[model samples]
Target: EACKFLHQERMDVCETHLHWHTVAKETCSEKSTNLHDYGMLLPCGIDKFRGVEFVCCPL
Candidate 1:
């Protein structure tokens, strides 16, 4: 739930070619959520970023 909320708030920033590693770290830290879980919530459109691999969760 928290992950989804943060994703919406920062989706625009993440869409601007910003590195997912950095964004994941910062966003998770700000929300006090697990970085691993936050990475799982990464939007599919971000898959184009080179070397940015996101873990798939069972939804």
Candidate 2:
């Protein structure tokens, strides 16, 4: 299956970090900080509030 592209909010421009949620569909949740399998991190820094980009692939 194709990877699910997700997004998270960043406080500042330097907040270019990715947090993997333990739960499959919780990574893109509000202020989530967990890690699990089949998950991936990609830095696509773009947005006024410095939003962070993410991805979750189904294995």
Candidate 3:
């Protein structure tokens, strides 16, 4: 199996982090794209999902 490292960060009690370590050795991605939702947008889906926008996160 392969190994990868991921760091999680939150902007505040309402917003999530970019969740993207585009500079990490392992990086973060599971598909052709590397971009993720990163933040809790819509100002209403903080507890869970928010909008229709979502991206694949590296495992």
lDDT of 2 by residue, 1-59 (tens): 45556655544443322332333346534324332234323435461224444565553
Candidate 2 scores a C-alpha RMSD against the true structure in Å of 7.8
How much does candidate 1 score in TM-score? 0.34
Compared with the true structure, what per-residue lDDT tens digits does model 3 show for residues 1-59?
A: 23332334334444322322232222334433454433333443544322223344444
Model 1: lowest-lDDT 10 consecutive positions: 50-59
Please tell me which predicted candidate would have the highest lDDT against the true structure: 1
What digit string (tens of lDDT, one per residue) describes model 1 on residues 1-59?
42333342344433433566666656555665545643333454644332233322222
Using TM-score as the measure, the top candidate is 1
Residue 23, model 2, lDDT:
30
lDDT score, candidate 3: 0.36
Assess every candidate by TM-score: 0.34, 0.32, 0.21
- For model 3, name the residue pairs that clash: 29-58
Please report, in order, the local distance difference test score of every candidate based on alpha carbons: 0.44, 0.41, 0.36
Candidate 2, residue 56: Cα displacement in angstroms equals 1.0
